[PDB]
Paper text:
PII proteins are key sensors for the metabolic nitrogen status. Af-GlnK3 shares the canonical fold of PII proteins, consisting of a four-stranded, antiparallel beta sheet and two connecting alpha helices. It forms a tightly packed trimer with approximate dimensions of 30×54 Å. GlnK proteins, when activated, are sequestered to the cytoplasmic membrane where they bind directly to their corresponding Amt proteins, physically blocking ammonium uptake by inserting the T-loops deeply into the transporters' substrate channels.
MgATP and MgADP bound to the protein in a highly conserved nucleotide-binding pocket, a cleft located at the interface of two monomers where the ligands are in direct contact with the B-, C- and the T-loop. As under good nutritional conditions the ATP/ADP ratio in the cell is presumed to be high, the ATP-bound state of Af-GlnK3 should represent the common physiological situation, signaling a state of sufficient metabolic energy. Even in crystallization trials with high concentrations of magnesium salts, no Mg2+ ions could be unambiguously identified in the binding pocket. Structural variations in the conformation of the three phosphate moieties of the ATP ligand were observed within the asymmetric unit, and the T-loops were still disordered. The bulky γ-phosphate moiety cannot be accommodated without breaking both the salt bridge between Glu 38 and Lys 101 and the hydrogen bond between Glu 39 and Lys 58. In consequence, the base of the T-loop loses its fixation points and the entire region becomes disordered. Whether this state of the protein is competent to associate with the Amt protein remains to be elucidated.
Residue numbers in the entry:
A (entry chain A): 1 to 39, 53 to 110
B (entry chain C): 1 to 38, 53 to 113
C (entry chain B): 1 to 38, 54 to 112
Amino acid sequence: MKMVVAVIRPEKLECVKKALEERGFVGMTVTEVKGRGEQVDLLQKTKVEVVVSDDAVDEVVEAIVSSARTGKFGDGRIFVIPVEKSVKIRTGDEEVA
Amino acid sequence: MKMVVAVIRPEKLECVKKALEERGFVGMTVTEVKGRGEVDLLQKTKVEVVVSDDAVDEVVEAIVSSARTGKFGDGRIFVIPVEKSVKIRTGDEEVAAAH
Amino acid sequence: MKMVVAVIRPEKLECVKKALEERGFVGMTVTEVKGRGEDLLQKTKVEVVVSDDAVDEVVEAIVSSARTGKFGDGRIFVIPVEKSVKIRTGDEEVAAA
Ligand SMILES: Nc1ncnc2c1ncn2[C@@H]1O[C@H](COP(=O)(O)OP(=O)(O)OP(=O)(O)O)[C@@H](O)[C@H]1O
Ligand SMILES: Nc1ncnc2c1ncn2[C@@H]1O[C@H](COP(=O)(O)OP(=O)(O)OP(=O)(O)O)[C@@H](O)[C@H]1O
Ligand SMILES: Nc1ncnc2c1ncn2[C@@H]1O[C@H](COP(=O)(O)OP(=O)(O)OP(=O)(O)O)[C@@H](O)[C@H]1O
């Protein structure tokens, strides 16, 4: 399992949500953040976290890249982090790699 | 070490906080988030606790029991590896086994 | 690649920002959080994704600029990052082998 962490322009949230939903990726956690790159320096950004299985990573990344890009500086970054265990609170069932 | 990341109902924060504290897990970082899985995005609470490998199951069980309602939307817990843990005050760094 | 996650006192943000910028680490994501250690108080989360060899330099920069010597100075967590993608170009940064 992997956690796909994307930091995008706030106005692109709806595009990213739809591009994900269309491909069958309905689960997500969204956080309001601030940041800067090689560009008051800290500007408003949006963080989208999606936990998926290993094989779905490239599809999720391609969905975010296509829906979040503008071609201008400040489009954002996607970070892929390993997830060793995923637990459903309701049932107590644990998904392990 | 591992980072236990739990996304819970905002009203369950006090239960989770109290449950973790009882078991000796006092250190935690809390973030106000939004999410979906099944208005669109709904208000949720993210609780992050960095613990040693052997304490993971106990931390997960503490969160599961205190955050549960039996209804859909109870939340998820994600376990992430932590390679280095640094205490700012002393500069002391905690590193995982082997090498 | 690694993600350096620092949880600091909110008043130390400008120090940390400057200390990282001086060393060439301009890219960062900041989140307003709450927490406790050894009663949930306002804290600042700073995330910086860097290459493996730059980790120690980044950690030392944060430690020196964020410390006060008093309890509540915070923690730095180092998390592995398998892939880093630039949304604008679609270019992927991975560790060779
Ligand atoms: N190394 C990094 N670590 C953590 N967050 C980062 C990093 N680099 C960028 N970010 C985050 O992604 C957001 C967008 O950064 P972005 O790199 O796209 O800006 P940039 O200066 O215009 O460069 P470019 O589009 O050419 O890569 C930042 O505001 C910040 O929140
Ligand atoms: N795959 C995922 N990646 C990231 N965050 C997720 C994912 N799945 C769920 N979440 C987060 O967890 C919260 C709860 O998700 P969900 O709607 O599936 O309810 P649940 O309690 O996890 O599961 P269930 O519907 O089976 O009871 C969401 O609002 C979202 O913040
Ligand atoms: N184990 C942990 N897991 C997650 N976040 C933590 C953890 N420990 C501390 N934090 C975060 O770092 C912040 C600062 O904690 P800190 O450790 O500096 O306080 P303290 O424990 O009272 O003092 P000290 O570490 O010097 O004994 C907390 O408010 C919380 O947001």
